[PDB]
Amino acid sequence: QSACTLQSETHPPLTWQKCSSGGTCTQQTGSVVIDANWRWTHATNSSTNCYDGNTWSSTLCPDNETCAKNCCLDGAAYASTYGVTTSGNSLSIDFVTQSAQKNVGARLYLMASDTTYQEFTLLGNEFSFDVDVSQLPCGLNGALYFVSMDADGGVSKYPTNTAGAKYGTGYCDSQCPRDLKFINGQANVEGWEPSSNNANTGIGGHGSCCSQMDIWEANSISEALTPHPCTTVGQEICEGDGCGGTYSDNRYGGTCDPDGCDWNPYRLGNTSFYGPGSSFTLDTTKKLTVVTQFETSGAINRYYVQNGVTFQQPNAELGSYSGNELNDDYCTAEEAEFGGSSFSDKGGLTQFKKATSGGMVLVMSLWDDYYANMLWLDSTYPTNETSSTPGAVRGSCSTSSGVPAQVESQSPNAKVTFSNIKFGPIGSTGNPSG
Numbered sequence: 001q002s003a004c005t006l007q008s009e010t011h012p013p014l015t016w017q018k019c020s021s022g023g024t025c026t027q028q029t030g031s032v033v034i035d036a037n038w039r040w041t042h043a044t045n046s047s048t049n050c051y052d053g054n055t056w057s058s059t060l061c062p063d064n065e066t067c068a069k070n071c072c073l074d075g076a077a078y079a080s081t082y083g084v085t086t087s088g089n090s091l092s093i094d095f096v097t098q099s100a101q102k103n104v105g106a107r108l109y110l111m112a113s114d115t116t117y118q119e120f121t122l123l124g125n126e127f128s129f130d131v132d133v134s135q136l137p138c139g140l141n142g143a144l145y146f147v148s149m150d151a152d153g154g155v156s157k158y159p160t161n162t163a164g165a166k167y168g169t170g171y172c173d174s175q176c177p178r179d180l181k182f183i184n185g186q187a188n189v190e191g192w193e194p195s196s197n198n199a200n201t202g203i204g205g206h207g208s209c210c211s212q213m214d215i216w217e218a219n220s221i222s223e224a225l226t227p228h229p230c231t232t233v234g235q236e237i238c239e240g241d242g243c244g245g246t247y248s249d250n251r252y253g254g255t256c257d258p259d260g261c262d263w264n265p266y267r268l269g270n271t272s273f274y275g276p277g278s279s280f281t282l283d284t285t286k287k288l289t290v291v292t293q294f295e296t297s298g299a300i301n302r303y304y305v306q307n308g309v310t311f312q313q314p315n316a317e318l319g320s321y322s323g324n325e326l327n328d329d330y331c332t333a334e335e336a337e338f339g340g341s342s343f344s345d346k347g348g349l350t351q352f353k354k355a356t357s358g359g360m361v362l363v364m365s366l367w368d369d370y371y372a373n374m375l376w377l378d379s380t381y382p383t384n385e386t387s388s389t390p391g392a393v394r395g396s397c398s399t400s401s402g403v404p405a406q407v408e409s410q411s412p413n414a415k416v417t418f419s420n421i422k423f424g425p426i427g428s429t430g431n432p433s434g
Ligand SMILES: OC[C@H]1O[C@@H](O[C@H]2[C@H](O)[C@@H](O)[C@H](O[C@H]3[C@H](O)[C@@H](O)[C@H](O[C@H]4[C@H](O)[C@@H](O)[C@H](O[C@H]5[C@H](O)[C@@H](O)[C@H](O)O[C@@H]5CO)O[C@@H]4CO)O[C@@H]3CO)O[C@@H]2CO)[C@H](O)[C@@H](O)[C@@H]1O
Pocket: 037, 038, 039, 040, 041, 049, 051, 052, 053, 081, 099, 100, 101, 102, 103, 104, 105, 106, 107, 143, 173, 175, 177, 179, 180, 200, 201, 365, 366, 367, 368, 369, 370
């Protein structure tokens, strides 16, 4: 797709700190850009939509190539249309915003310039950030993660995409998402099937795969840390059900691991560590600091800070595994106790290390789940299982929670605020900001 300018594109600025092993941090100035799926896609020569509701224009988009040729992505009114605002080192995303039409959340990428994404090499470094999840009830997910996306949004590899990072193109993740309207400079109209429950969405014949480091997926009830390896490290297109993931019938018939080696303290047995109020170690009604370290062995460490008190990731005992570090022994023990082979089938942490060794783009989003109501994160899943089933209970939310239409109606003013991002060598982000 190309870019159009009926509506100006002004990326909300966002600063972050780059820290050094020497003990000092220096402020960096970037900005955020919303994913292309949220935008108005219209004809290059008029205001006629190429996509509207849950269907593509049969005339403007008779096939993937013709569609990309005739269509362009336009600018976004961040605050008024998408409820996305920034202030210094803080970024806030509202759940439901009402303008000409209704909008639910957003998926944003941190930029290096107005036309390129910022890339981060996680291996040997640590990433720190503050987050307020107080306004995130059951069924919602304020996520902060990294994916192996191209810095230009795919423009160099696919010339028919001239919109680029400036218009949030090029997304990919471990689900090999097939809901994306444009992949590899072509539309996804071929094989398009509208969603049963989401008026704005559908599933196309193509998906976009790549490694994903889910640093944070959480609400005020539950939180999870999850690395997801793929046989192909970076962005790569996939065909239909061979994509696997959430958008396919068979989630494991692809190149990426859709489950990952997840670490949810509650799921692992510590039901008193993270939650709303003073009865939890970390009180989710208040802002907290989350630090994630990627040691060169490929293992991942984690600690939190709230009110000046530091807490390492709680210890967990699963099978023969015991400790608080997410390493090979943990991931293997998890598959043994909870079940599954997706993570190891895709290469485990060794394969995942190939992603953290290279550059990855920072993503910040707020979403509700039209496929599983976020039950996998904060409730019992599958819903017919009990606490006797290993790993089934992940949170205290009712198995009836998270219906998108219900939560959007009941908690429209829900939101998430990510702030004070700091990145640098392990042991450096806790030093004074510049
Ligand atoms: O009035 C302006 C202009 O509006 C045009 O219509 C727009 C409308 O303004 C937008 O609000 C709307 O935005 C929705 C997208 O259409 C839809 O694709 C997207 O779908 C989300 C889904 O809701 C969400 O659950 C899913 O979550 C992912 C997370 O983002 C990731 O972080 C996580 O890892 O994985 C989950 C699961 O995949 O993401 C998908 C997108 O990939 O939801 C948007 C918000 O509701 O788009 C409309 C266009 O389709 C209108 O056409 C113009 O005429 C008008 O001028």
